[PDB]
């Protein structure tokens, strides 16, 4: 039967059948619960809201993301999200459909084991497999060589791969992501005067970040231009009806990816981490990695990200070196596209973790096929 | 049919049909194996890489030279290299083509026997023969009299030959070669500050040695000039993009051939060994050997080698003696050219080890025709 | 006057007067700088923190080790550390006290020259000298014959010495050290679930490595026992108050010294490098080297290191050979003890680089007395 590919990263759970060029169902990986006791008795009130329903009733619900950073903070909530995906979004019984999932590199095998145990004892799927997100991104890009810098809403990692073999010793994982960028946008918005403190407020700030933020090419000159000419100002309309005028915040919210000193973490920026991962590899395969850097995730859509990354990595890297920042469209769903390609490949169909193999061995079987 | 001449010395396996003035196929005698478990499943991954493919994927492979010094360290790897030569480089089935090989003098007949057994039980070649490399060099030089100082990447040997008869009692074999020179270049490069420790790094250092090193005429004055004027400095571009400035190393890397005290071996230099081999022969045939010294191998290309050898051998040898250091171009492939000439000669065509003779006698047949 | 011996290796700068059996002052070779702009104005805030003060304020400082591998990455920071050693730790004006230092073998004379220039133009010490660390370790061990395998926080090198003369042609330097082991401990800790990414986090991980890691005698059986019985688990208390339970990490963090394939470097393990250095020497002095192997450095304290090294070197070395792994206590300060012994020796007192000799010749004087 047709295998199912589900990517729970990038803040929004994207799932669909293998082979398609786009995911069938996409929605935020969000679980909502009521905050006030209701008075309506005739109206059907459900104890928990998941995904699009929780988004619709965002104003009167508490929102908890199950996936934090790259680890699970509420296995009950993630089980609820998976049930929603399998029964209310894709409309397919997992009892007869093999499933494929994604997980960020350098993640607890405690998390991986709970993932496998949930999917095998709750949904009893005939087969299962767990793959690295950025490897799937490289699958989607087609090329079999080149560093992939994935940066979802929870994780920011790079896994350089050369000529068919990965480089597990050069994997760098970084914490700055969509959630941290949203938090910085919160802080800078209350700096301007618009105070946001609520899960609903957080989602509105995330929408503002998606639809207004961009990365400059030279931060100092951009800041001076925005503070002097005041021509970069843009407006946004909140659901309450009050307009928000945003100035320096546009290129200060996503500047933390390159200057994490704004958020205070000592870790170097995304470009510096990519460059360090490049130098961590062998001295001979450096140029092919330079020429085939791939971006993905949900925190890469920003305008000018490719130009800024190219400029910074050119400044860091030695001269006489061509660094083509491959940033194709659909980076948001590139991970899912790669997962679909991997599941559709016939050779990979034999490397799955079958139910019989699971019942025979268990946790070992799962950290032995990854 | 056309006989095949294969020279596995000089670090790079050179093979081709007999009669041609240049070898048909040349490539490093190198075998590569993956160092990291791959993640790509669709991409065709082969367990072993040999020759040019291993050179192309040098950065993510472990490289082991089968031929060490002048002896085989991995018969499986050399069988793989021979299979590559016979099927993927020369594109000729050995089942109907006689084969000729080369071997350094003073080499284990255990090695020779394993060579013959491999080539007769694996490739089932109708006929076979093993010859001395430097005798082939003398064949290529045309002259039927004169010491040949061969120095490949593994061996450095001289076999004086006079008027059609060799001198087995004056054969001197020395260990300094391309591998030792590359190791000394490694040590002096980490002395300067560029640390190299990898097989890929070793191959890059070998390339640097080929394209930058040269032999001076007076070591002390050259060292003083390079340390004072700093006009001998040259730059090189690594595949990673970092330039390397090389000073005294240029004429210190190949100076070990004349002053092996740098590498610590008590054995005298190449010129001193040549002179000793000259005096080891008869008192009457000394002058013809002096006037017809022949160089060959892959560690002789260096600039100024002929001038330095001439000066040193003139200082060592008595006066009123003309020592013409015959150093023709194509010394790198001179061994193969001589092998092709020997195989093309019609008189030599009867001194081959046929398959029937092998099956009749074996090891004896092979140390009885050499 | 009493000469001063300063060892800047092993990650922690150890210095003190010559003749003493223990160093007077010891502290990490660490320089700290503020990460956030302060608000306190009355409190005395200094621009840079060095050594113990930086360790005390580790949580709010950025920590950069001046000595990287075996080379200097910030001469200003190392000058600051030396000033701290000379004025705030040993409390002695270097204007009237000769100084002795240590440096790993196969190190850039650019680094050595900057060392000498700093110490002669900044501290104007009447005399100076630079010695090899592992030779000092052999001095401390007393024996005048036997390979010393030094492995500090930056370098891992062996310099076989026989009957009063060193063997410069058999010196093998390896990059695996305390910093690499700490990095592997970081990776395996975020593998378990405890993510560490900060200089403070790195220092905490280094402390955990010091106080919890050990080397097994058979890696496969130890891994099986730890994964099955779960009796090797140990706990640690972070300064934040959260306990850390560590299992396989205990003997996986220092297993990289013997199986560097875990960190991905192609270089062979410490035991294999020691064995290779043993075979690199003369065929007659091999047994005395075997019977007198000496360990030192700050990455040797681990439990079971001597037993594992003895087993591995016995397996590698031929039989009927006694390999006594001499691992005396105080290996951490053995280098400094040897330096103190060398400075206290009266014969060595004439081989110093005086200030007049420096002003007369310079860089040459310094690479001519080493």
From Swiss-Prot, chains A, B, C:
Cellular component, GO, one term: cytosol
Keywords: Acetylation, ATP-binding, Cytoplasm, Cytoskeleton, Hydrolase, Methylation, Nucleotide-binding, Nucleus, Oxidation, Ubl conjugation
Tree of life domain: Eukaryota
Leading EC class: hydrolase
A Pfam short name: Actin
Extra facts: In vertebrates 3 main groups of actin isoforms, alpha, beta and gamma have been identified. The alpha actins are found in muscle tissues and are a major constituent of the contractile apparatus. The beta and gamma actins coexist in most cell types as components of the cytoskeleton and as mediators of internal cell motility.
Protein name in UniProt: Actin, cytoplasmic 1
